[PDB]
Symmetry: D2
Amino acid sequence: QSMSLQGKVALVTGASRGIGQAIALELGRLGAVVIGTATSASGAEKIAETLKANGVEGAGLVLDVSSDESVAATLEHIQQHLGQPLIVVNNRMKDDEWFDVVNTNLNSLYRLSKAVLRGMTKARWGRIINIGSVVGAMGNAGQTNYAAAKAGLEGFTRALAREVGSRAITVNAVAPGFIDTDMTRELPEAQREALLGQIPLGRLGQAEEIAKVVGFLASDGAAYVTGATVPVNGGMYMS
Amino acid sequence: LYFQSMSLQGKVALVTGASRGIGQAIALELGRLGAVVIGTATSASGAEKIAETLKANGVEGAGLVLDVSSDESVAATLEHIQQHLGQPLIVVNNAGIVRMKDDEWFDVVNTNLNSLYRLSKAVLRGMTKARWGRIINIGSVVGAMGNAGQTNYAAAKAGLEGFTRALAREVGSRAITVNAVAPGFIDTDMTRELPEAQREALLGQIPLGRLGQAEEIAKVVGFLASDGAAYVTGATVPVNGGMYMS
Amino acid sequence: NLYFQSMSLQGKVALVTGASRGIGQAIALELGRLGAVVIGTATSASGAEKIAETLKANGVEGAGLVLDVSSDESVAATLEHIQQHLGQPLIVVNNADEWFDVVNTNLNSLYRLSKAVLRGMTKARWGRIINIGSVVGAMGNAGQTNYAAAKAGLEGFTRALAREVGSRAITVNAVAPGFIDTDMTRELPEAQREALLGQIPLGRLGQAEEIAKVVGFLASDGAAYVTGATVPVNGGMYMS
Amino acid sequence: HHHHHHSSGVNLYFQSMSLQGKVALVTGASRGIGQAIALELGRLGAVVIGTATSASGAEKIAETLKANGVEGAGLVLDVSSDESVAATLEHIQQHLGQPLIVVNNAGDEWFDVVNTNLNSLYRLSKAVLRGMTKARWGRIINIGSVVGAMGNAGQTNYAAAKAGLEGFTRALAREVGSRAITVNAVAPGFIDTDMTRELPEAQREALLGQIPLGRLGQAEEIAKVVGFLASDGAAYVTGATVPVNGGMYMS
Ligand SMILES: c1ccc(-c2nc(-n3cnnc3)c3ccccc3n2)cc1
Ligand SMILES: c1ccc(-c2nc(-n3cnnc3)c3ccccc3n2)cc1
């Protein structure tokens, strides 16, 4: 009742599996009408079936956050059938490609965030929640990319929060640690063992434990939290 | 056998400095979520006021006198709670110790962390036995408007973060989480008193354009205490309306 | 022996972008003072000429060149020209709804120049890349937002590039100035300066020279184990 | 019996010598980092008082100073004791002058370790501040601990000590800045000491894998940074912690 999102529309990107899907189900559990997105029509349909199977109202759709056209078209569709999303959740490697990876990720956050801000500004209320990437990839390049993406996400989140706060729109981030998903489940055992050894709690996190934090941030009780990045990592801090 | 999101039914919670403001709002929020709540104060009148507040809101628990600077007060208070209510598995540290100068920070931080440590170590034994716990440390609000106020606030906040992260690392294998909540400018007795032009300027450093309510702090505490926050540990959650000063 | 171990820059070529005034010019003179051959750059021919005159007047060998760090072509052409006529720069100092584009542009420029100069440093197995942050630009909320964002981007970028190139004995550091005495701060009403000074423990503005001295240290052999760091030069005034 | 005060015994004018005979107090100067710091400040022209907790350490410091042509002394000092600190500083003031450069390098486990270390930094810092305030000039430089051990306990202690040092340094800087006294810290990473020199090669290889520069730092590389912070060119640097870790960042 206190935690309720009844009457809200929520847009969760990348909702067809793992953390995105858990987030979609948690906001649904709390009463939101949920629009979950995937990059394929089959993913969108899977989202709609998942939603239905858990008794959550809303829809799956196709969204490419790298495209201005996909973003404008998708928001127009949502406004036409439902209304304005006021909760929006944005959800080896090489040694040298950290720069393009971060740059792309932040350009996508920015693109979607700016597009949804018009509606939140009209409503004088909003929640933007950015989900960082999960710990996992191998060696020095993986560590470099993780730390860079996390620093980008924190600084971006703080700045956007300063820019939009006078409108009663909060902007926060959740930075996960080593979370049990399809992408971490079949990491080489030795890499997994070593990651577990760096975690005080001595276990992987669950997607649901990320989603609970997102659901708190989306609620009215988190209205004075903004510009924050909440680490959800079992005490494993990697800079 | 119940199993609900956010529920603290069956838990005993100890909230230090619970007679007013943030501490009292925290005590009521944990009560709202089903905890048996023990709130503490350094005086018998503060303890009575806590008992009355709890009773008036239909929260089971007690108000007790506790001096966190004293090993004897800490052992006595825990023994009493164990006898009459059970082991506190949720512990919220909100107790801390003319105009303010920038030379007070050392003794203030030193005293506060020594007390956090004393209480935390005492309650860990029960949590270790239960293989479950929540320790939540509340930071101090911005105490004055100028440079001295910033210095003292930034020092206390840096101490609290580092302490919190370290203790979390020390106790995590036992499924005990240790987190902190760092308020910014909260509507309390301090803010209520200052000049109107000075208020306006204060609000101008806060992106949300308003003071925080004690209740907004308490809601964050209540989340951290829940099962859903089980993989959050070592964290400091800023609750400051976007006003970041270090 | 204890008393003779070079912390001078004789025999090095240094490239200092945005060298026509203020901080960039002081950095160019300090590296010159320490013995480097200095190429300072500006975006205009007039700025380049001013740099050449300033260098000549202080007895520093090098040149003033035109360089636009936002352009791949200007960057490749200018380095090729430097390699032909002076040698490979092994010390490179980057000094040249709004916050997002500003940070994005700045980091794209740092990345472009850094990658271009890394080839020569890799060949020499030695280098110094030093990024200069922006001074506190403006007084209000927008200024704070822009300043903190640019600083956070600079720090993360700096740390990541340092990790990428460290095995080659190339260090990558940043210097983050606070309030510095420049054309910006000179124009403030006399009283508004007093209020600004009240937030700075040291009670004064920094000098361009004080930024330059820190750069000159980072460039030296004694700073060889410092990488990935951002050195705040702000008189104790910290804002994030 | 034990003598606690040992002078170094010490016409070339070295280009390096800019600290002009100013007096520098370097605690924990008998070996490793402390000793390199003492030599570097000597190289830059300071009169250097290095301290150790034993008379034999103090004598070793005096010999090291003498052998490098540095003017100053080795003294006994216990930074955990108010009495040792007051007595030693009074002695220095009488016999050598007010130290205007002070380098603090002498320092369930993490809490008591950090607490003790900060209390020592505070005690010494407060004691030397009167002389700096009179001179309207000073440098206080705090040296963090090296990465002490390989596992979780080592990481907890290291991160806690570092976070305490940074927050303390910034707060003290704010407190003493209006007097033109700077307060900074240097946070080392993995440094080549007697301890690290003798680890099994497979353990050393794995350690080096976490350091982008691919090597241990030298004590001298810490000292150089301290020396820069002590100079007039670092006058607008205060409240800062300079990491010196080859790109290895642990929190
Ligand atoms: C673990 C991590 C940090 C700290 C600690 N202690 C302090 N402090 C202690 N006593 N006086 C000041 C601090 C004072 C100012 C700023 C940060 C501080 N941090 C202690 C344990
Ligand atoms: C590695 C580490 C960090 C960043 C990065 N990029 C940004 N950013 C990028 N593009 N536009 C803004 C940032 C914007 C605001 C605050 C911090 C930022 N950090 C990039 C690489």
